[PDB]
Amino acid sequence: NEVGYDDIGGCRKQLAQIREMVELPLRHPQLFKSIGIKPPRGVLLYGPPGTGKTLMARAVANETGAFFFLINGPEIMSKMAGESESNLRKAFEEAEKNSPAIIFIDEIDSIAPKREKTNGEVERRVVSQLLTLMDGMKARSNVVVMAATNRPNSIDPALRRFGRFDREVDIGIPDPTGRLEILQIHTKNMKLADDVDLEQIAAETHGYVGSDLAALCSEAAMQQIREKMDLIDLDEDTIDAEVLDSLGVTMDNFRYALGVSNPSALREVAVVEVPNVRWEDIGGLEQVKQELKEQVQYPVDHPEKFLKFGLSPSRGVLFYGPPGTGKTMLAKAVANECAANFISVKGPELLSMWFGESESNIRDIFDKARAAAPCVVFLDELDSIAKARGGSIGDAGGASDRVVNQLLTEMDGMTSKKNVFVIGATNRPEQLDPALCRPGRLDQLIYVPLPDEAGRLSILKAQLRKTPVSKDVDLAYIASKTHGFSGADLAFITQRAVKLAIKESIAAEIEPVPELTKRHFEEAMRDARRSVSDVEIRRYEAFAQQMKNA
Amino acid sequence: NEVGYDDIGGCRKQLAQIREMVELPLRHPQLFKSIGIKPPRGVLLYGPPGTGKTLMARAVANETGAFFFLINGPEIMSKMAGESESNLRKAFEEAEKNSPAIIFIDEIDSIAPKREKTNGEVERRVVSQLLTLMDGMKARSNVVVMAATNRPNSIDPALRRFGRFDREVDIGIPDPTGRLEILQIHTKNMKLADDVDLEQIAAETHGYVGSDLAALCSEAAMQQIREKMDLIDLDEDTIDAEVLDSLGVTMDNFRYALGVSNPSALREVAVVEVPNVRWEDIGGLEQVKQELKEQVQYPVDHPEKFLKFGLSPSRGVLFYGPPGTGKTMLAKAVANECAANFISVKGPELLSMWFGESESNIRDIFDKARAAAPCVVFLDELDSIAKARGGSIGDAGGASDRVVNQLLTEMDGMTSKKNVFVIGATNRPEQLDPALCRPGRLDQLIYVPLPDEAGRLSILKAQLRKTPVSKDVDLAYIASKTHGFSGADLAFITQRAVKLAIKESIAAEIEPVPELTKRHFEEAMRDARRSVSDVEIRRYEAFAQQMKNA
Ligand SMILES: Nc1ncnc2c1ncn2[C@@H]1O[C@H](COP(=O)(O)OP(=O)(O)OP(O)(O)=S)[C@@H](O)[C@H]1O
Ligand SMILES: Nc1ncnc2c1ncn2[C@@H]1O[C@H](COP(=O)(O)OP(=O)(O)OP(O)(O)=S)[C@@H](O)[C@H]1O
Ligand SMILES: Nc1ncnc2c1ncn2[C@@H]1O[C@H](COP(=O)(O)OP(=O)(O)OP(O)(O)=S)[C@@H](O)[C@H]1O
Numbered sequence A, B: 001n002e003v004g005y006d007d008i009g010g011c012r013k014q015l016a017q018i019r020e021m022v023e024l025p026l027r028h029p030q031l032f033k034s035i036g037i038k039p040p041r042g043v044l045l046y047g048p049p050g051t052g053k054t055l056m057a058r059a060v061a062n063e064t065g066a067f068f069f070l071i072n073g074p075e076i077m078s079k080m081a082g083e084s085e086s087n088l089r090k091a092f093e094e095a096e097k098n099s100p101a102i103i104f105i106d107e108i109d110s111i112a113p114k115r116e117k118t119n120g121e122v123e124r125r126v127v128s129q130l131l132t133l134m135d136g137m138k139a140r141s142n143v144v145v146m147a148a149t150n151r152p153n154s155i156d157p158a159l160r161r162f163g164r165f166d167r168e169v170d171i172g173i174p175d176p177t178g179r180l181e182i183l184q185i186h187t188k189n190m191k192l193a194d195d196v197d198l199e200q201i202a203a204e205t206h207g208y209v210g211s212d213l214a215a216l217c218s219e220a221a222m223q224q225i226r227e228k229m230d231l232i233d234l235d236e237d238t239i240d241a242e243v244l245d246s247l248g249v250t251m252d253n254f255r256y257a258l259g260v261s262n263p264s265a266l267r268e269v270a271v272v273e274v275p276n277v278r279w280e281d282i283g284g285l286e287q288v289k290q291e292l293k294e295q296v297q298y299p300v301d302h303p304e305k306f307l308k309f310g311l312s313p314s315r316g317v318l319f320y321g322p323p324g325t326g327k328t329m330l331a332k333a334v335a336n337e338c339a340a341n342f343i344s345v346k347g348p349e350l351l352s353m354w355f356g357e358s359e360s361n362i363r364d365i366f367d368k369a370r371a372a373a374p375c376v377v378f379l380d381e382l383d384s385i386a387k388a389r390g391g392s393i394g395d396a397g398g399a400s401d402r403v404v405n406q407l408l409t410e411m412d413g414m415t416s417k418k419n420v421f422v423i424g425a426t427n428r429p430e431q432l433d434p435a436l437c438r439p440g441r442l443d444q445l446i447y448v449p450l451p452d453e454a455g456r457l458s459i460l461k462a463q464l465r466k467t468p469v470s471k472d473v474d475l476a477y478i479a480s481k482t483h484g485f486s487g488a489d490l491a492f493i494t495q496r497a498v499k500l501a502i503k504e505s506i507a508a509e510i511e512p513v514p515e516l517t518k519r520h521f522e523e524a525m526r527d528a529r530r531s532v533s534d535v536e537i538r539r540y541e542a543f544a545q546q547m548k549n550a
């Protein structure tokens, strides 16, 4: 119940920050005294809910030799009027007494909402009590104030101003590497069986917080007990120890526990996440591959030539082309190359968060990408922004609405020195306003054509990298016959053909064929159907000839 | 008044959960101690109102040897300021005193609304009192907190976060099997007559909660007394016992009680319910029957071939075709085959719940289907979503509105590993945006043609399975003459012909004839009228030739 550094894992970069911010001024205040700067007393934690934010507090606090004081958000708000503000005054006097001191406040937004958006003056006093007492502190006190929340936007920003809270520290969703470590934290207390592959689990878990993983560990434990319920009689007052020794959680319990309701995660926000697709997994289009190698990889790798040449680059890249051409995966593979952070934002994600009005988060998309620089910001489904008013034809309203007017501010509100990059992608590029296509905003426009038969060969090579295909498969004879078919169409054929294979596989199981026959294919090849009209392409090829007329 | 397990019935799977969650840590805390996990102290009950949620609390609580404490929602809110929060502190100290303890809180939303949507700070204190005192508990306390509500969305979600309430337990509407059991619970105390067939009643009751059934039992009792009111004089101070012995409730009292006012149920929500129609009840269209056997039955039966083949399936199926082609029943019969759970959602059900703004429920549609996985989510009347803005022509607004932008998020917010399935059905498929028809969202598109005369034969065989038809009935001669007539038209003819039969049946009464004559038919056959123009079909057949051009 007392937390060390080993009890938390995965968010190493974040803990590297806090040790510089909290561990460093306390065990060595002389360093800031020798260099002659002020120690930051404004450490702020934030992130998604249930992400160890309370856990990382004591992970730092118990690893000091400093005094610690604890404040809960609702504990002060539970108290009566006046007495609640007394405890804050009782808090800081003890911390300024025991001068090496740590003040952590969990759920800071409950005692500090926006003063504009609040009703009770008792809430307004305790905010005003907090704003007063933060400034009443001293640098000679050597007392560090920590605060955590899950809603960094609901806070009164006067705290987030200078002198009170300056150190915005986000706790992001961990990678499969770091969440593997988190599983090892919870399972090292657990009693498992030898079949348990956490690395298989951590690969199969993608958007989970540690609370989801701890519930995941707690869930598969229960199913292990459910298997033993036949051997366990509940009318007994104590079960025997032999079933306790056999109580070892199987890998299949986690396979059970991956398909249950725990696995509903918290992924419905504006997330930053490193991608997984690469250049080999996208067949063909090597010209625009190198164009991204030109336009976005050269700044993130070498800003030195720019200051050599005195020229800031174009930060605005627009993808366009026919639909179903893998334009979503393109920005993921290039962020996976130069290891930049990645933020996927779709069209209705703007709108559905604006039926709930999350537009500071839209600014925070740029801010977190500024916080996670180098980062690329990917705007999927830009036609949906036009389809917020139906289209450019639409309900007579064009692409421009409150979304565009927000984005044009935030795209122009980006420093050109920043390597934070914005990637736009649509399939209906005529149906977007040129105000967003304005130079400085989005001036690079990249057409994504259909592949040729060599590209369609390279896709079918790349798509079937994980499939047990047959040996007689002439993909080139497929690539000969597939001409007008998109890369989405080719994957759609394989989804048909695998379904045709399962119409042989479990059909034989009810009557292992791990091979995808020509008979599986020539049925789907006869059933093959083109999804893109060539007269639609003649539009895009005229745009590929010239869209700069606009 | 003291409730055992036998006093509740029907929701066996839910009680199987709670015994794992409440009975299991209390009579054997050693199991979680031996396996080394934390016992969940966050049991939350929810469901429709009047569904035994208060009843199942004591059904668990009286079946422990544990201490129990009771909290009512409005009882705390009835109290004065400060004193109300005192009783919560007085609650948990007694439970942490008597350490095997059960804390049930009925109507948790009354003491815990959303802190964003509330006015009194006294409400905000008692929420803050609750959030504090939940975290003040210990695992060594071995104290379980139960809470029930009928509005799971009105709660402050900080309770529903980790450490406070993790175990979301829904109490669904029971099947006719389980509600049969509920009738036997109430009637075993009652004095009935021998004509009483609860199984006939439980078949005839479809969307009732146990409160509706208990009112149903109480209603037919009163009509039984109404029959005895001639033998009962109210000026008497005590009626004789002979009418008490004859006071036995008839089956016809329930036949009276089924048509009364009670039978208004609570069915106006997003419900999950297993269907009843099967493949035999839908004549013809065996091709798209097998297509559903391919596309949706293979994943729900065998995910093993997918991980064999490394390919996630297409989770998005769109039904389309001309109107009145039985497309509503298609998703019901396939959920009845592979025993998956079923959620019927119509078009205006989205809209009418969004004039009252129930969109978390729209997310909870996917969440409850995730809770009731395997489940299929059926979206009836997708043209109505377009008709929210009139159509795609409409009021110049297309299909896209706040509904689509919500659904595109929630459809994309589904894990591909989940067997939770989404089934779309419209009759105006041109009038829907391709953004919803996007691959990953809804890529399987299934045309539903009119049947042939053999299909029209199979329908008239299937529709007349429960009708006392005549013996001279040449359905093929009907099927010869019925050519352009839909399956809805054929049922419409029978509704005419039965009305023509009742224009012979009770006409002969006014002057058993349980046969549907050719004379009943050839009148309706002469009165037969086609509902679908063939030029409308030539649209759909061109879509059936090619809609992939979009
Ligand atoms: N990354 C993680 N590593 C280990 N345990 C974790 C992690 N994330 C969450 N947990 C566990 O889940 C709990 C989440 O509790 P809290 O940190 O209080 O939640 P939070 O992160 O503070 O956000 P709140 O409390 O909902 S505002 C932790 O106390 C741990 O028990
Ligand atoms: N050339 C291609 N190579 C590999 N995969 C492709 C290719 N074209 C399409 N796909 C796949 O088909 C889907 C289309 O990806 P997206 O880029 O999202 O489609 P889009 O071109 O953006 O247009 P929409 O409206 O989103 S379908 C993805 O699952 C891709 O993996
Ligand atoms: N499934 C059921 N089985 C047996 N009796 C039931 C069932 N559902 C409701 N009842 C009866 O109806 C009463 C309604 O009380 P509860 O349903 O427990 O209250 P609730 O479920 O919390 O819903 P509220 O009070 O309207 S929010 C119960 O006390 C039972 O007598």
Ligand SMILES: Nc1ncnc2c1ncn2[C@@H]1O[C@H](COP(=O)(O)OP(=O)(O)OP(O)(O)=S)[C@@H](O)[C@H]1O
Pocket (backbone or CB within 6 Å): B281, B282, B283, B284, B322, B323, B324, B325, B326, B327, B328, B329, B427, B451, B459, B486, B487, B488, B489, B491
């Ligand atoms: N092939 C069929 N087999 C059996 N019943 C059918 C058939 N076609 C239509 N019906 C009946 O016709 C009615 C129409 O059902 P629905 O699915 O609602 O019709 P639809 O095709 O979905 O178009 P609408 O707009 O709902 S009328 C139902 O009562 C069906 O039982």
Ligand SMILES: [Mg+2]
Pocket (backbone or CB within 6 Å): A050, A053, A054, A106, A107, A148
């Ligand atoms: Mg917290």
Ligand SMILES: [Mg+2]
Pocket (backbone or CB within 6 Å): A327, A328, A380, A381
């Ligand atoms: Mg796309």
Ligand SMILES: [Mg+2]
Pocket (backbone or CB within 6 Å): B050, B053, B054, B106, B107
């Ligand atoms: Mg109740």
Ligand SMILES: [Mg+2]
Pocket (backbone or CB within 6 Å): B326, B327, B328, B380
């Ligand atoms: Mg219908």
